[model samples]
Target: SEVLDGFDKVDKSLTSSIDGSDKRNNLVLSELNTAYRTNPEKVKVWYERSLVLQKEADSLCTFIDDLKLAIARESDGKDAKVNDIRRKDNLDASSVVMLNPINGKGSTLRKEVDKFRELVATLMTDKAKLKLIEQALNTESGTKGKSWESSLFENMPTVAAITLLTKLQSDVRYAQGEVLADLVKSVDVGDYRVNSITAQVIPQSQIVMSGDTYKANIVLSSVDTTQRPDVFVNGKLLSPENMGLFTATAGAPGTYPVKGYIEMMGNDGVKIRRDFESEYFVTEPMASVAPTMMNVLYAGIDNPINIAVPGVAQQNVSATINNGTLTRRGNLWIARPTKVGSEAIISVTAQSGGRTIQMAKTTLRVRALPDPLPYIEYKDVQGNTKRFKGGRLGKREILAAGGIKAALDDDLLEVNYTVVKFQLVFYDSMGNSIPEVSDGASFSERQKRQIQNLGKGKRFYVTEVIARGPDGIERKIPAIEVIVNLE
Candidate 1:
């Protein structure tokens, strides 16, 4: 009894999902609409196919309903209703009626299920839904290898048999709805009307650089609010809803080609084809103001800068600095600041539309060039001039080096520094510091003599180093320690 109640709840839910009579009514109303009847040949075919599938499904469901009522009558009485069965557990009655070799309904039910499977499989494209339909209406034999009819109705209770029949009715409707929805969606109602016209402007480029003229092609075009022309982009036919439109994401900077064709039915029922091909360029980001260096302006030295405004020529762009003199040479500008630790404000203006417009202004910190590192510049045996910053140095290489040179060689800023004067401090045998000073960048005669006297493993320091950069600021730089190596 409990099992029968559970089966009743499930059958009611499945019945609600299968509304065959209502769907057939909707199908009839849909047929009266002339919009789909006048659509393309393919669309008309889909609509007719949908009608056939729905009608077949309704017929199969009606057959299942009659079979369920017959089983209820045989089990409980001639006038017994399927929902209010009196002999819910009458097992022998179902087996006798459904499994009788001559007048058996089980064979008839299996044949109808097989017929529906063959019919619906033709209309399905989705592999998943096709497999699901296959499982739901499967007529294959069971584990005991008996016939499909025998396996289902052999010794089954009247209520259980009726519930199983109700499920098959729902299965037919499920397949019907799947195929019908797909066919109807392809014939969207909007694809049948042409009632609008307008003027459209298609631009060559939306973002134009200053000094570059804005270009666009203006034309009058007509649109169909209900229908869209078939469009193919790069050989792939676009969806009806997305007809006449193409989209692509810009990745790397390069030129991309677009080629496609549009097909529309003319008023005379003849098809018209129009071909189109174009190219678009993706550029590096432009239209900006930036310091060519590390966004810092060195006091007293020219800092290179680059200023640009989209659609404007460099000749029509001008810039000024608040803390120094700003000079331009074609595409490059030089900023020479006058004060350290202050900010340099650069204002730029471009001539556009017959007037000068201020495009951008940038404030850069004014700073002295970082202190340079002093190293012994010497020519190696391979003729490469390598700078020895501070480490073990071969005595011959140390002697061959002229003197100290300093520069900001921090990979980025490569400004040179002039060695004004430096002192060579040596440790005597008693470990006292002996200092020898050079008036300029080159080694003096006394300093050369000191290096000559130094034995292997002896160490000396280059200290009190003074250097001047292009910024004209004199700075005391770090010292270099050189230990003698014999080779």
Candidate 2:
């Protein structure tokens, strides 16, 4: 009785289990259907879950069959096919085949399971297709979709969906290149014309007058589309925008002895960097005063001017004078006039081989006497004096006019004559007033010559005496000397 009860209990449990498996399958299908209606986008998730449920239902069929076999054994051969029928019930839940003792029974379950698998595969494929369509919409259209011109889709193939994207990339690259080229071509360093640059000046030098104004004209060698570029002066940016032409003025002159560079951008927005520079001399104008006679007469006799094209040969030279005689000495051409004159015009033309290469003209002024008001005399400390000869005293007069002082000291005298010779000393136009020379503080060769030429053989009076004693203090000693003319 207990065995019969066990068989009845197994039969009931098997039937209940099959019923539950069927209910579960139906519930999964209903949930999948609702997912399609309300949230169709999530249909893929439903389909995947349904596949898992179907697999679980198929697995339960084996338990159901085991229970049926137990019941059939208790029934004592009443119907063996009852167990087969229960085994066939496996197809109802899930078509997965199981190990069955009966022939052809497992084959039916195999077919059913394969059918379910095919159905699930079809759902997955449908979800994939839907996803592809969604992707296409997002990439090429509407509110959620991106514009095809976006760089993300730049290299994507041009199909019906992405045609605009291909066009946008081409336009972008072309525009980029154009802007780059324009930026580069705007600055032209090669064809710029530079002018009016001045030479460098020494430090602490006073500027009496300035004539340095740098000017330049530039021609574009290439066209720039953007027409905007940087104008640089000595590598400094002048304008950050706009570009027809540019000019810079560095007005207050001292000495900025350096070169300048300019870089430009082309229409395509490409930088074409270039550089150009030159050196010049900037100087203060000389002080205004009467011409202190430069005794070029001795220079004319001793050095005699030679006219030539500096680098050319000497054989082909010719000269003419209006009121003087021009004579050739070796390669030098000399102009010698016997009488003093107001104006003499001398023209010289130099030829090298057969070509007339150089020409020059000079105006000469010869004076017989210095102006009488500024008469020249030399005075000893004892008030002895002498007058200058040949009107050459003009130079001495200039030195005295420039405020040089003269004195005579017996021991300090370089000459052995009984009458102590006096020396006249002139200061530089801008030199220190204190009359002490320092190491390496002597005048340059050129400066020494200038001061020496001022006092050469010209006599001066002790008319005004400002003297510095050994104590280095200055004193003014009043004295006067009459001019005694040996002539």
Candidate 3:
């Protein structure tokens, strides 16, 4: 949940204001850093602007130097100071580096661009002194439109132009860094979904029970250093150092679909996000040959279980049933549990050709079946009451049958059985509303002819069943009827 909140934080509203700008249409780089996070491509303009700075400033700067030197040669006999200024300031290596034309971030970042612009302005200020040098040089060379590189007597450099040029060179060095390389490193290019500008994870696709920790090594790119970035995985926000830890194995079974969320500064001083996108899948371990039989075994009764063959040919399968005995018939094992107070261990060995594999160790809760309800089976499914009805009958062979049936948690009491037994009784109508003797669940009318002298017509007999379950609770079966008529 915290991770989800952190991801949401990436798109959350930033209350901070844009402090200011570097130049007439330029906000500070820090401002732009937060401002332009959503539109990563907008930063390309800064990089492109930096490329032609050297070309833009070179001609005017060269001309400024010439005028300054000509002015210096005639500066009231204090030429030595101007010479020092020339050596220390003119043709500074830092100025050249600052405007290398290839330095994209050179003029893109507010501070870096500000430094470049400051230097350019410093050099441009000497245009006034340059006019003096221009007139003198054209007068000396008949207006061939240029002065020699160093005529030894050409002219003196101006004190003002020289001072500004020196300052410009010194200041340009302060432009100090490059950003294109860093910016390019953080963007998604063509590798992901819509507008994903955050750090992307290289998630793992395959996992096995045989290996160690899960791995989702990722690298955060296209991010602005100035803006705060929060990384969220599975909706959980993680610190910068904790990214690798997310891929660490924390569960017995590896889980997947790890997501990454990024919130950082974009192009226009905006609090931006890279949204969410990631998927890490796990390859599950193969389940070997095992018994897929139900876990319960009845006490003192034949329990039927089957070994689950997950697509393997079952040619030779065997099992061990403790406190009981097992009989096998292709994929099926029947065990008769001998005890009732304790559990029985039922294990199976699935064999094919030369080798056998052990199945899952299953336990049979050796226990009695719960108390069952007794039912009389007098009717043959098609609704026949097993009575001498549709014929000339007084007393026929009336045979009836009955049995017992016993039918979660904390979901407790694991009592199971494949079959159980029962006892029976006769009552009401069919049984002449008295205690009639019935043999177990089955009985007969031995007094068939003797009954003709007892009832005249429409005499009915009904039977019921009774038994006890493991719960020790007695159960009752519903009554069923048979008829005899003296018509």
Candidate 4:
């Protein structure tokens, strides 16, 4: 009961505070790095060290949580939770799981903590803090002649075991925060004293489509806001009011170079010169918008289309289809037109320069779906369905086919047509025509008997094949003649 009270009192609360403290420490470390950007070299070294410290600390803490969960599972069921543990006062679960000898988790925790302490020691040098960390992570045997794993978890209740693991997690986070703060102190935040300044150009965009402006800002390194340098481009000096803003109109589709230099008077009343060189690319305006399936859109069926603008993100590119409904399915477009024969004009636009610009328009003809061919579908030797349009067929194959099916087996289109009705014509020995009508796609019982009793060398015809397509239109399909094979 006391162990349960302890777990309810501190197990969850302690972990929460540890996480909260770690989050604050991480934020402070990030702020310090950003604030000391001038000392890139010093900040880089401290950043690497902080990364190693954070990784090891986090790994060890997660391992401790795993131990807590393992003990909880042993006390309760496999689906036990730290907060909802049923056998919180159980004294044998921790010992069974932690001291199992072969797969004991205590030994693993001990090694992880030791390695973490060693890593922390390398990142920190203060002897007093180092002593504290060693004490917190101490896994060595006590002088009472009991092993560390046994003495700690031998008869420990579930609550006490879990609370102890929680404490270790808190300790690791505390050590991580201390080391992170110390690393933040080692950063050289003092301003740099340098006598050299380099001239450079910062372009708004490196690639400019024809008719768009190629703009860049030419400024000196370590720029002094009070003093403006005389910027020169292509041997022509820029006006002072332009404030280092360079603009050029792109003409051709090729690479162009921007070469210039900066001249400014130094504090010693001497002229300082720094050469600057840069380049920009000019390309013809282009956009790629095409139908993925075919150049034509079919009525009543979804046509797959693809639309894109070069140098523009997929989300930023928008498209609309005239005479149809165009909806976006991620990077693809589905166009469904209601009317056939009218053209589907796919107009493409892109979000550029803070406004939507018309990029391109693709004219796709809207056509009705092609009429499907009727065939007898039957299983072959391998159990695969084979379509027999018109050919010599065995009597068994005809009986197994059951009825007729229609489909447009075009390579560019996959469309299924439902067979509405059909008629079968059989010629008897007297040259008389025996016509059997099937109301649906499947064969009638009379038709099946007629097919079964047919003699060798006799033939039948499947005519008046009517099918409904996906566009909801009925069409009369072609007929198929089957010559009976004795085999």
Q: Which candidate's lDDT is highest?
A: 4
Candidate 3 Cα lDDT to native: 0.42
On lDDT, the stronger of 2 and 3 is: 3
| Per-model TM against the reference | 0.48, 0.23, 0.33, 0.45
lDDT of 4 by residue, 374-403 (tens): 887867677787778898998988888778
**473 in model 4: Cα distance from truth in Å?**
0.5
After superposition on all C-alphas, the RMSD of every candidate to the true structure, in Å, is 17.5, 26.8, 20.5, 33.9
Pairs that collide in candidate 4 are none
Model 3 stretches with alpha carbons more than 4 Å out = 1-51, 69-301, 305-319, 327-333, 338-343, 347-447, 456-487
Give the TM-score (vs. native) of candidate 2.
Answer: 0.23
Please give the range of 10 consecutive residues that has the lowest summed lDDT in model 3.
13-22
lDDT assessment of candidate 4:
0.78
| Alpha-carbon shift of residue 252 in model 2 (angstroms) | 11
lDDT of 2: 0.39
Root mean square deviation (Cα) for candidate 2: 26.8
Q: Rank the candidate models, highest lDDT first.
A: 4, 1, 3, 2
**Can you write out model 3's per-residue Cα lDDT over 75-151, one digit (the tens) per residue?**
33345443333322233332332234674222332243344455433332224354343233222222255322222
Tens digit per residue, CA lDDT, model 1, 1-487:
6667787777777666666645764664375345465645566667667667767777888988888888777776787777756536557677877787789788887788777777777765455555565556555555577787786787788878877777777666665666666656545444435577788999978875544467899998777865567888877887776655687788786778878988877643468889988887665675444447656878876778878765466698899888989999879999889888988899988876676777557888888778888998877688978788999998789878878888776736557678899999998889788899975998888898999999999899999999998877789999989999876
Off by over 4 Å in 4: 1-201, 209-215, 221-294, 411-413
